[PDB]
Amino acid sequence: MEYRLKAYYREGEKPSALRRAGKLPGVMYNRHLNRKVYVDLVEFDKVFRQASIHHVIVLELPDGQSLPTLVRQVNLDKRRRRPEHVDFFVLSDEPVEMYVPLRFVGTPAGVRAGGVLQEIHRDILVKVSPRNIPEFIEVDVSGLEIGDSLHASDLKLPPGVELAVSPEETIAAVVPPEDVEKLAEEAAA
Amino acid sequence: RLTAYERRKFRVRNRIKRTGRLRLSVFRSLKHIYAQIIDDEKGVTLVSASSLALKLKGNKTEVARQVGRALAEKALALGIKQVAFDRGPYKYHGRVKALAEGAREGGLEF
Amino acid sequence: AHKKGLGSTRNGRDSQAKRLGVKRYEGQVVRAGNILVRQRGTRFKPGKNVGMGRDFTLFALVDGVVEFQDRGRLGRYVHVRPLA
Amino acid sequence: MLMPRRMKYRKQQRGRLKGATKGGDYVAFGDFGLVALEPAWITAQQIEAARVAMVRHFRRGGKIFIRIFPDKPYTKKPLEVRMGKGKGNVEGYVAVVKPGRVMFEVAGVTEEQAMEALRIAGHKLPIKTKIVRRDAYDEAQ
RNA sequence: GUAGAGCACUGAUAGGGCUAGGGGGCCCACCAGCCUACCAAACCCUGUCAAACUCCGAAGGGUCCCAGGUGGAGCCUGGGAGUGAGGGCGCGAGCGAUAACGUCCGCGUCCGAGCGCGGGAACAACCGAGACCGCCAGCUAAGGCCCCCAAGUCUGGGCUAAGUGGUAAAGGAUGUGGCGCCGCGAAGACAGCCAGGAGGUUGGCUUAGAAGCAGCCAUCCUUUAAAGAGUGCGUAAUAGCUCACUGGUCGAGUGGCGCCGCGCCGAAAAUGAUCGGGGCUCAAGCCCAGCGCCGAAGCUGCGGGUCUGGGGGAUGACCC
RNA sequence: GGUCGCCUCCUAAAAGGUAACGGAGGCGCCCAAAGGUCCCCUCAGGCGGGACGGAAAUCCGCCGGAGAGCGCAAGGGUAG
RNA sequence: GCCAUCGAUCAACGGAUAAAAGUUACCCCGGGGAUAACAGGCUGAUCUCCCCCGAGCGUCCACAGCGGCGGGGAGGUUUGGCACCUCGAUGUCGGCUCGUCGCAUCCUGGGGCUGAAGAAGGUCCCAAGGGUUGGGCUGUUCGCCCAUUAAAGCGGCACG
RNA sequence: UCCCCCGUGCCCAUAGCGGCGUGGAACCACCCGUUCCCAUUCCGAACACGGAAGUGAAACGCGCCAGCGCCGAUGGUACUGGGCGGGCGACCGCCUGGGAGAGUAGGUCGGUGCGGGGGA
Ligand SMILES: [Mg+2]
Ligand SMILES: [Mg+2]
Ligand SMILES: [Mg+2]
Ligand SMILES: [Mg+2]
Ligand SMILES: [Mg+2]
Ligand SMILES: [Mg+2]
Ligand SMILES: [Mg+2]
Ligand SMILES: [Mg+2]
Ligand SMILES: [Mg+2]
Ligand SMILES: [Mg+2]
Ligand SMILES: [Mg+2]
Ligand SMILES: [Mg+2]
Ligand SMILES: [Mg+2]
Ligand SMILES: [Mg+2]
Ligand SMILES: [Mg+2]
Ligand SMILES: [Mg+2]
Ligand SMILES: [Mg+2]
Ligand SMILES: [Mg+2]
Ligand SMILES: [Mg+2]
Ligand SMILES: [Mg+2]
Ligand SMILES: [Mg+2]
Ligand SMILES: [Mg+2]
Ligand SMILES: [Mg+2]
Ligand SMILES: [Mg+2]
Ligand SMILES: [Mg+2]
Ligand SMILES: [Mg+2]
Ligand SMILES: [Mg+2]
Ligand SMILES: [Mg+2]
Ligand SMILES: [Mg+2]
Ligand SMILES: [Mg+2]
Ligand SMILES: [Mg+2]
Ligand SMILES: [Mg+2]
Ligand SMILES: [Mg+2]
Ligand SMILES: [Mg+2]
Ligand SMILES: [Mg+2]
Ligand SMILES: [Mg+2]
Ligand SMILES: [Mg+2]
Ligand SMILES: [Mg+2]
Ligand SMILES: [Mg+2]
Ligand SMILES: [Mg+2]
Ligand SMILES: [Mg+2]
Ligand SMILES: [Mg+2]
Ligand SMILES: [Mg+2]
Ligand SMILES: [Mg+2]
Ligand SMILES: [Mg+2]
Ligand SMILES: [Mg+2]
Ligand SMILES: [Mg+2]
Ligand SMILES: [Mg+2]
Ligand SMILES: [Mg+2]
Ligand SMILES: [Mg+2]
Ligand SMILES: [Mg+2]
Ligand SMILES: [Mg+2]
Ligand SMILES: [Mg+2]
Ligand SMILES: [Mg+2]
Ligand SMILES: [Mg+2]
Ligand SMILES: [Mg+2]
Ligand SMILES: [Mg+2]
Ligand SMILES: [Mg+2]
Ligand SMILES: [Mg+2]
Ligand SMILES: [Mg+2]
Ligand SMILES: [Mg+2]
Ligand SMILES: [Mg+2]
Ligand SMILES: [Mg+2]
Ligand SMILES: [Mg+2]
Ligand SMILES: [Mg+2]
Ligand SMILES: [Mg+2]
Ligand SMILES: [Mg+2]
Ligand SMILES: [Mg+2]
Ligand SMILES: [Mg+2]
Ligand SMILES: [Mg+2]
Ligand SMILES: [Mg+2]
Ligand SMILES: [Mg+2]
Ligand SMILES: [Mg+2]
Ligand SMILES: [Mg+2]
Ligand SMILES: [Mg+2]
Ligand SMILES: [Mg+2]
Ligand SMILES: [Mg+2]
Ligand SMILES: [Mg+2]
Ligand SMILES: [Mg+2]
Ligand SMILES: [Mg+2]
Ligand SMILES: [Mg+2]
Ligand SMILES: [Mg+2]
Ligand SMILES: [Mg+2]
Ligand SMILES: [Mg+2]
Ligand SMILES: [Mg+2]
Ligand SMILES: [Mg+2]
Ligand SMILES: [Mg+2]
Ligand SMILES: [Mg+2]
Ligand SMILES: [Mg+2]
Ligand SMILES: [Mg+2]
Ligand SMILES: [Mg+2]
Ligand SMILES: [Mg+2]
Ligand SMILES: [Mg+2]
Ligand SMILES: [Mg+2]
Ligand SMILES: [Mg+2]
Ligand SMILES: [Mg+2]
Ligand SMILES: [Mg+2]
Ligand SMILES: [Mg+2]
Ligand SMILES: [Mg+2]
Ligand SMILES: [Mg+2]
Ligand SMILES: [Mg+2]
Ligand SMILES: [Mg+2]
Ligand SMILES: [Mg+2]
Ligand SMILES: [Mg+2]
Ligand SMILES: [Mg+2]
Ligand SMILES: [Mg+2]
Ligand SMILES: [Mg+2]
Ligand SMILES: [Mg+2]
Ligand SMILES: [Mg+2]
Ligand SMILES: [Mg+2]
Ligand SMILES: [Mg+2]
Ligand SMILES: [Mg+2]
Ligand SMILES: [Mg+2]
Ligand SMILES: [Mg+2]
Ligand SMILES: [Mg+2]
Ligand SMILES: [Mg+2]
Ligand SMILES: [Mg+2]
Ligand SMILES: [Mg+2]
Ligand SMILES: [Mg+2]
Ligand SMILES: [Mg+2]
Ligand SMILES: [Mg+2]
Ligand SMILES: [Mg+2]
Ligand SMILES: [Mg+2]
Ligand SMILES: [Mg+2]
Ligand SMILES: [Mg+2]
Ligand SMILES: [Mg+2]
Ligand SMILES: [Mg+2]
Ligand SMILES: [Mg+2]
Ligand SMILES: [Mg+2]
Ligand SMILES: [Mg+2]
Ligand SMILES: [Mg+2]
Ligand SMILES: [Mg+2]
Ligand SMILES: [Mg+2]
Ligand SMILES: [Mg+2]
Ligand SMILES: [Mg+2]
Ligand SMILES: [Mg+2]
Ligand SMILES: [Mg+2]
Ligand SMILES: [Mg+2]
Ligand SMILES: [Mg+2]
Ligand SMILES: [Mg+2]
Ligand SMILES: [Mg+2]
Ligand SMILES: [Mg+2]
Ligand SMILES: [Mg+2]
Ligand SMILES: [Mg+2]
Ligand SMILES: [Mg+2]
Ligand SMILES: [Mg+2]
Ligand SMILES: [Mg+2]
Ligand SMILES: [Mg+2]
Ligand SMILES: [Mg+2]
Ligand SMILES: [Mg+2]
Ligand SMILES: [Mg+2]
Ligand SMILES: [Mg+2]
Ligand SMILES: [Mg+2]
Ligand SMILES: [Mg+2]
Ligand SMILES: [Mg+2]
Ligand SMILES: [Mg+2]
Ligand SMILES: [Mg+2]
Ligand SMILES: [Mg+2]
Ligand SMILES: [Mg+2]
Ligand SMILES: [Mg+2]
Ligand SMILES: [Mg+2]
Ligand SMILES: [Mg+2]
Ligand SMILES: [Mg+2]
Ligand SMILES: [Mg+2]
Ligand SMILES: [Mg+2]
Ligand SMILES: [Mg+2]
Ligand SMILES: [Mg+2]
Ligand SMILES: [Mg+2]
Ligand SMILES: [Mg+2]
Ligand SMILES: [Mg+2]
Ligand SMILES: [Mg+2]
Ligand SMILES: [Mg+2]
Ligand SMILES: [Mg+2]
Ligand SMILES: [Mg+2]
Ligand SMILES: [Mg+2]
Ligand SMILES: [Mg+2]
Ligand SMILES: [Mg+2]
Ligand SMILES: [Mg+2]
Ligand SMILES: [Mg+2]
Ligand SMILES: [Mg+2]
Ligand SMILES: [Mg+2]
Ligand SMILES: [Mg+2]
Ligand SMILES: [Mg+2]
Ligand SMILES: [Mg+2]
Ligand SMILES: [Mg+2]
Ligand SMILES: [Mg+2]
Ligand SMILES: [Mg+2]
Ligand SMILES: [Mg+2]
Ligand SMILES: [Mg+2]
Ligand SMILES: [Mg+2]
Ligand SMILES: [Mg+2]
Ligand SMILES: [Mg+2]
Ligand SMILES: [Mg+2]
Ligand SMILES: [Mg+2]
Ligand SMILES: [Mg+2]
Ligand SMILES: [Mg+2]
Ligand SMILES: [Mg+2]
Ligand SMILES: [Mg+2]
Ligand SMILES: [Mg+2]
Ligand SMILES: [Mg+2]
Ligand SMILES: [Mg+2]
Ligand SMILES: [Mg+2]
Ligand SMILES: [Mg+2]
Ligand SMILES: [Mg+2]
Ligand SMILES: [Mg+2]
Ligand SMILES: [Mg+2]
Ligand SMILES: [Mg+2]
Ligand SMILES: [Mg+2]
Ligand SMILES: [Mg+2]
Ligand SMILES: [Mg+2]
Ligand SMILES: [Mg+2]
Ligand SMILES: [Mg+2]
Ligand SMILES: [Mg+2]
Ligand SMILES: [Mg+2]
Ligand SMILES: [Mg+2]
Ligand SMILES: [Mg+2]
Ligand SMILES: [Mg+2]
Ligand SMILES: [Mg+2]
Ligand SMILES: [Mg+2]
Ligand SMILES: [Mg+2]
Ligand SMILES: [Mg+2]
Ligand SMILES: [Mg+2]
Ligand SMILES: [Mg+2]
Ligand SMILES: [Mg+2]
Ligand SMILES: [Mg+2]
Ligand SMILES: [Mg+2]
Ligand SMILES: [Mg+2]
Ligand SMILES: [Mg+2]
Ligand SMILES: [Mg+2]
Ligand SMILES: [Mg+2]
Ligand SMILES: [Mg+2]
Ligand SMILES: [Mg+2]
């Protein structure tokens, strides 16, 4: 739940060049600092797949620095569906907003009834200090029948963690399945 | 959001400001009345007369007349003679009127 | 042979172009009377030495130099600074 | 059959199809999606056709998402008539799709099940397509 | 106020939440409790769409001032016109069918009038280039350098095996080279070899037995180095008989997924064929790098003509 | 067959202008107040409360920048 | 005359007269390939042919024979679109005569699968060498019908 | 020449909504009264006049806090003036200059001019 990844500085070098040279341009900022950076693409990839916005990534800077960062945002090539830039948000002692992976557990009554659990939110935005960033946030989705749902206003919350959205943000629900016989009255429509 | 107070103010003030003359503005508190003369080009008061500053008293209307008269004295001295009357949110009547009437025979051209 | 039951067109017209717009710009020298802006409504407002005609036309009242101004919520204004 | 309930205007100019997709480029609902590789006017017939194909494939089960909608009126002048004398009539609606646009999504159906179903769907579409899995990249968007 | 983008307005919009009302059942009705895998206004979240939507908004474009700019520039007055069928190409739109050597506009260009010159086989408008005249001199452009046909059968480095090159799509494939990621592995794997691979199936059943193998009927339990109420063959049927499977043996690599380069199929026409032809396969094809050279009426050299300007003339004639 | 003049919007490619038997709509009137001026006032809509009285008549309260109104089509403008 | 003002669906709205509809195959002249009908050409919507998908049918079994909803092409026979050659003339259907070429093959030849027992048939592949009848009806092309046949192919050639 | 208040402009929400607190010496406001001037399609609500018993409750001024609203980089990308290349073709790609919108970090409970009154 704490990852490393080597980073490097950059100035004039054109992003285009850097990309077709297998690196990935980025940036590194918080209220106090802001620095153009780049990482190895293939190296970022393997890390980011696991870490995501959810877990802290530590940037090994050339000047021997080791910075705690969250990935704040990631810019995609629309055509290619492939990363073209990264934002690294350097953590400070301060509390920070962030997305924490929800973990639904227990197979819902509705899923058994033949429905399907639509996982509306997969992470939830939260105020929390770095030293105490949680991860798996369990959710009993088991009592959920078809036509029911639960909201943010129904979450575990480890201590020292703020429901940083509307409480009424609907978290997940259970929806009736696709069904071939529905096509009948869809034809009768 | 706006009070009818404010709406009147803008409405009568803007019209006068367009004529480009000097502006005789007026404030009419429950206890006093004040009148300053303004160059809206530069945004500056050229001369001012008031009840509080005059250390004056003796029935509001009769008082008001004098502050006008006094206003003209200091005005004409400076060179001011041509002027336009900002009657503010107040109906041209009574106290405000008296200020005008005084400032008139006091020498101001308006 | 060819020319079969075709159709018609229930519309297909327009009005004449009205040549609206700003006619003199910031920094342009102008004679009193010069048309400064042709417009519909006050897309611009008359400022210093600028009058407005019945169809919202903005013209100079003095010989001078045209000057523009955006006063935010109070609208945009065309002025004419006279020249000494 | 998709089409607007109501319409501000009945006929609509054709337009070009410049650039990559404007947005709707990341998976947002299910686990797998179908992505447009080349641009096209996707007919309301095709949308529906793909939809049915998936439905049918995993008979009763899973949920299908449809991230495209035909709001563009498609015109056609009658057969064997000449140019001019007005614009043709509306004869259907299309959805303008561009490369990168995820068009369908599925969920709550096994990985193998999703793969075949989305695959069949693409066969109905007039363009080249690719299937994709929900990524860390998608959830980041 | 466009391209882009955006949803704040006007509309559109999929899912979810929330929630007036509407519908089905219940209570049963008189009013009220209804609860609702149905329909759904407003509203909220996710996710989008629009020439006649815009909270936003470039690049550009326009005009003004200052500066450069002496040009077959510019401005004023007047004499003489011709033109008022245009077209192709690039780009931006409408119409059309995201047809047309289509049509209608806009910006540019060329043909028109440059059907004069080089290239593109041939070819107004594509690439190169604006032809005053002469030369058996030179340099270059595009395009080329194996022969027709001027110049490298030049030099490195890859790919292609289809004559692809030498003109087509969805989509199909153990083509081929190159990158990856994923399990397997000598804690002897993959390929075959291989002793083994009894059912108390007394299948719940079956009827001229329809006792594992028409009969998609819990779809048993055993001895374990491993043997399924069965992956199969003679059957409506007993025999027979493969597979699963562990077991050694073998000894060193094997399996699956993804991306890139180049190629294969899909690929049927009417007088005789063909990449212009011959012909071409570590190329005479494709891609990367380098050094040469060929070549147009362009540019240069030499001679001459004429127009304009500026000098000369310390004058016309003439001269530079 | 349709059209023929005028106006509004788009097409129109961010100055002006710009075509098609391209996409949508209007006009051939009107007002002695719907004109001039001085003075005063501020909408629509929502929620709550209120005899007859309702979705909506008139009254009270709180909210509200303009989504109302501006004779007429549309645009622009507009409660300073 | 001057000044003010009135009479215009002069609406074909820059308004030809104060005052005006048809017809010609009985027709004529000047022009136009600036412009239609024939044919060519570009296009290929329509037309014909061939594919991709595999929903489902075929007792059983997606693929013997079939192929929902949809998707991609080839051809240039049909009807069109466009108006590029031709209006100082490119004669237009069917028949006859003479053919010749294409092959997406009607027959004959060689094959694969078959829900191929055999005989037959179905479907696909190869193959253009040769062959592909005579009548009734209608101007007919097309089409129906009679009698046969190994078969009574379809297209191009200015619908030769 | 620092502080508070009053009138008035300018910048036009970083200034606003909302919340909590503070202020009556002075100013200002509500306040007191309807004789007079003036006034209400009814009402001294408003406008107006004569006042000063009361109060900062309202309003207003000044603070404080970031729920709302508003502002919002850097980095990257879209698009693009100009110049090019690949592909039969649909469309892609390169150099050069310019460069958004969204979103991220983050900012904000205003800043200033002229006059008047009152302070230390
Ligand atoms: Mg390390
Ligand atoms: Mg800071
Ligand atoms: Mg690497
Ligand atoms: Mg550390
Ligand atoms: Mg369960
Ligand atoms: Mg629901
Ligand atoms: Mg239906
Ligand atoms: Mg329906
Ligand atoms: Mg407001
Ligand atoms: Mg008012
Ligand atoms: Mg007002
Ligand atoms: Mg000022
Ligand atoms: Mg006294
Ligand atoms: Mg007197
Ligand atoms: Mg005087
Ligand atoms: Mg015809
Ligand atoms: Mg007709
Ligand atoms: Mg009609
Ligand atoms: Mg117009
Ligand atoms: Mg005009
Ligand atoms: Mg026009
Ligand atoms: Mg005026
Ligand atoms: Mg005007
Ligand atoms: Mg300025
Ligand atoms: Mg300003
Ligand atoms: Mg404003
Ligand atoms: Mg204003
Ligand atoms: Mg305004
Ligand atoms: Mg609908
Ligand atoms: Mg396009
Ligand atoms: Mg784009
Ligand atoms: Mg693009
Ligand atoms: Mg691009
Ligand atoms: Mg898009
Ligand atoms: Mg799930
Ligand atoms: Mg499933
Ligand atoms: Mg497809
Ligand atoms: Mg994926
Ligand atoms: Mg993944
Ligand atoms: Mg998220
Ligand atoms: Mg705008
Ligand atoms: Mg505009
Ligand atoms: Mg708005
Ligand atoms: Mg609007
Ligand atoms: Mg709306
Ligand atoms: Mg809506
Ligand atoms: Mg919805
Ligand atoms: Mg809903
Ligand atoms: Mg009901
Ligand atoms: Mg009932
Ligand atoms: Mg009842
Ligand atoms: Mg009862
Ligand atoms: Mg009831
Ligand atoms: Mg009753
Ligand atoms: Mg009853
Ligand atoms: Mg209930
Ligand atoms: Mg527009
Ligand atoms: Mg637009
Ligand atoms: Mg902005
Ligand atoms: Mg803004
Ligand atoms: Mg702007
Ligand atoms: Mg800018
Ligand atoms: Mg600009
Ligand atoms: Mg100059
Ligand atoms: Mg002439
Ligand atoms: Mg002329
Ligand atoms: Mg003419
Ligand atoms: Mg012409
Ligand atoms: Mg031209
Ligand atoms: Mg041209
Ligand atoms: Mg061409
Ligand atoms: Mg072209
Ligand atoms: Mg298009
Ligand atoms: Mg198309
Ligand atoms: Mg096209
Ligand atoms: Mg074409
Ligand atoms: Mg087409
Ligand atoms: Mg074209
Ligand atoms: Mg075109
Ligand atoms: Mg041009
Ligand atoms: Mg030439
Ligand atoms: Mg030329
Ligand atoms: Mg010629
Ligand atoms: Mg040439
Ligand atoms: Mg040539
Ligand atoms: Mg050629
Ligand atoms: Mg020629
Ligand atoms: Mg040509
Ligand atoms: Mg030639
Ligand atoms: Mg030529
Ligand atoms: Mg060339
Ligand atoms: Mg070139
Ligand atoms: Mg040279
Ligand atoms: Mg040379
Ligand atoms: Mg060149
Ligand atoms: Mg060269
Ligand atoms: Mg050669
Ligand atoms: Mg030669
Ligand atoms: Mg040679
Ligand atoms: Mg071959
Ligand atoms: Mg070849
Ligand atoms: Mg070649
Ligand atoms: Mg080619
Ligand atoms: Mg070819
Ligand atoms: Mg080729
Ligand atoms: Mg291909
Ligand atoms: Mg393959
Ligand atoms: Mg494969
Ligand atoms: Mg493979
Ligand atoms: Mg390959
Ligand atoms: Mg690895
Ligand atoms: Mg691993
Ligand atoms: Mg494996
Ligand atoms: Mg591994
Ligand atoms: Mg071991
Ligand atoms: Mg068996
Ligand atoms: Mg059976
Ligand atoms: Mg059991
Ligand atoms: Mg036996
Ligand atoms: Mg046996
Ligand atoms: Mg993979
Ligand atoms: Mg790769
Ligand atoms: Mg890859
Ligand atoms: Mg091929
Ligand atoms: Mg050759
Ligand atoms: Mg050659
Ligand atoms: Mg050859
Ligand atoms: Mg020459
Ligand atoms: Mg020469
Ligand atoms: Mg000579
Ligand atoms: Mg010479
Ligand atoms: Mg000289
Ligand atoms: Mg001389
Ligand atoms: Mg008529
Ligand atoms: Mg323009
Ligand atoms: Mg009336
Ligand atoms: Mg009044
Ligand atoms: Mg009033
Ligand atoms: Mg109301
Ligand atoms: Mg009410
Ligand atoms: Mg009521
Ligand atoms: Mg009643
Ligand atoms: Mg009321
Ligand atoms: Mg509105
Ligand atoms: Mg109303
Ligand atoms: Mg307004
Ligand atoms: Mg309005
Ligand atoms: Mg305002
Ligand atoms: Mg006279
Ligand atoms: Mg008429
Ligand atoms: Mg009439
Ligand atoms: Mg006429
Ligand atoms: Mg006449
Ligand atoms: Mg005449
Ligand atoms: Mg006769
Ligand atoms: Mg005759
Ligand atoms: Mg003829
Ligand atoms: Mg011909
Ligand atoms: Mg066509
Ligand atoms: Mg048809
Ligand atoms: Mg085919
Ligand atoms: Mg069946
Ligand atoms: Mg079978
Ligand atoms: Mg099946
Ligand atoms: Mg098949
Ligand atoms: Mg059907
Ligand atoms: Mg088709
Ligand atoms: Mg053809
Ligand atoms: Mg033909
Ligand atoms: Mg044709
Ligand atoms: Mg033409
Ligand atoms: Mg032509
Ligand atoms: Mg004849
Ligand atoms: Mg005969
Ligand atoms: Mg014949
Ligand atoms: Mg045959
Ligand atoms: Mg045969
Ligand atoms: Mg056979
Ligand atoms: Mg048989
Ligand atoms: Mg078949
Ligand atoms: Mg033959
Ligand atoms: Mg033959
Ligand atoms: Mg034959
Ligand atoms: Mg016969
Ligand atoms: Mg006959
Ligand atoms: Mg006959
Ligand atoms: Mg017939
Ligand atoms: Mg016959
Ligand atoms: Mg027979
Ligand atoms: Mg016969
Ligand atoms: Mg023939
Ligand atoms: Mg023909
Ligand atoms: Mg014929
Ligand atoms: Mg023909
Ligand atoms: Mg024939
Ligand atoms: Mg101080
Ligand atoms: Mg201030
Ligand atoms: Mg400021
Ligand atoms: Mg504000
Ligand atoms: Mg609050
Ligand atoms: Mg608070
Ligand atoms: Mg408190
Ligand atoms: Mg406090
Ligand atoms: Mg306190
Ligand atoms: Mg006191
Ligand atoms: Mg008294
Ligand atoms: Mg009395
Ligand atoms: Mg009285
Ligand atoms: Mg009065
Ligand atoms: Mg009275
Ligand atoms: Mg009354
Ligand atoms: Mg009255
Ligand atoms: Mg307060
Ligand atoms: Mg707070
Ligand atoms: Mg905030
Ligand atoms: Mg703003
Ligand atoms: Mg930036
Ligand atoms: Mg940049
Ligand atoms: Mg560019
Ligand atoms: Mg460009
Ligand atoms: Mg190009
Ligand atoms: Mg090319
Ligand atoms: Mg490309
Ligand atoms: Mg380049
Ligand atoms: Mg370049
Ligand atoms: Mg740049
Ligand atoms: Mg650039
Ligand atoms: Mg703060
Ligand atoms: Mg604030
Ligand atoms: Mg505040
Ligand atoms: Mg402060
Ligand atoms: Mg200062």
Side-chain angles (χ1 to χ4, degrees), chain C:
Chain C
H2 32 67
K3 195 171 181 173
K4 89 149 74 302
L6 283 126
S8 301
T9 350
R10 197 220 316 158
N11 39 236
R13 72 212 83 113
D14 205 336
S15 58
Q16 274 289 341
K18 291 327 180 67
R19 277 78 176 173
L20 299 169
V22 198
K23 301 305 194 187
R24 291 292 191 277
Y25 296 101
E26 185 168 84
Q28 296 215 209
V29 185
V30 282
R31 309 272 300 285
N34 272 191
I35 298 305
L36 300 172
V37 164
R38 295 285 211 173
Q39 51 170 354
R40 299 275 189 265
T42 42
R43 301 180 51 86
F44 290 81
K45 291 185 186 173
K48 295 168 196 142
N49 308 282
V50 167
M52 181 156 57
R54 59 174 300 267
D55 66 336
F56 289 101
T57 303
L58 291 191
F59 58 99
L61 291 152
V62 306
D63 301 329
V65 179
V66 180
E67 210 211 288
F68 277 68
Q69 157 152 55
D70 182 12
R71 299 178 66 184
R73 82 185 208 83
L74 304 188
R76 283 154 83 212
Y77 291 81
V78 184
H79 310 287
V80 178
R81 351 173 306 203
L83 16 72

Side-chain angles (χ1 to χ4, degrees), chain A residues 50-72:
Chain A
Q50 291 183 274
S52 174
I53 155 80
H54 304 149
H55 307 102
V56 180
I57 301 174
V58 177
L59 297 174
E60 308 186 298
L61 272 315
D63 59 332
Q65 286 219 285
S66 286
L67 272 49
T69 51
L70 274 198
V71 161
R72 243 298 168 268

Side-chain angles (χ1 to χ4, degrees), chain A residues 3-122:
Chain A
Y3 300 77
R4 292 205 154 266
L5 171 91
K6 321 180 186 180
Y8 316 108
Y9 295 112
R10 64 173 176 91
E11 320 297 354
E13 312 90 320
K14 318 302 287 304
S16 68
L18 276 123
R19 285 194 199 88
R20 74 171 68 93
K23 314 303 193 173
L24 165 64
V27 72
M28 199 176 43
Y29 60 85
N30 61 21
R31 29 194 315 270
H32 302 128
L33 67 101
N34 183 258
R35 283 299 292 296
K36 308 186 218 148
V37 290
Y38 82 88
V39 281
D40 176 22
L41 185 46
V42 338
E43 205 172 303
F44 171 88
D45 185 277
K46 47 180 265 297
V47 169
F48 182 74
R49 298 260 176 163
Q50 291 183 274
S52 174
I53 155 80
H54 304 149
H55 307 102
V56 180
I57 301 174
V58 177
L59 297 174
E60 308 186 298
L61 272 315
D63 59 332
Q65 286 219 285
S66 286
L67 272 49
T69 51
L70 274 198
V71 161
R72 243 298 168 268
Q73 94 171 10
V74 159
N75 281 9
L76 285 172
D77 183 328
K78 299 275 208 300
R79 202 185 295 279
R80 275 72 99 163
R81 187 208 201 266
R82 186 166 69 260
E84 66 188 4
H85 188 257
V86 233
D87 288 27
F88 291 99
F89 180 53
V90 180
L91 272 333
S92 196
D93 81 291
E94 313 162 29
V96 313
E97 300 215 270
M98 67 169 301
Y99 296 73
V100 197
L102 303 189
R103 229 308 78 79
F104 313 101
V105 60
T107 64
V111 175
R112 302 194 49 61
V116 16
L117 169 67
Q118 189 164 337
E119 297 187 340
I120 293 192
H121 268 269
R122 274 169 176 103

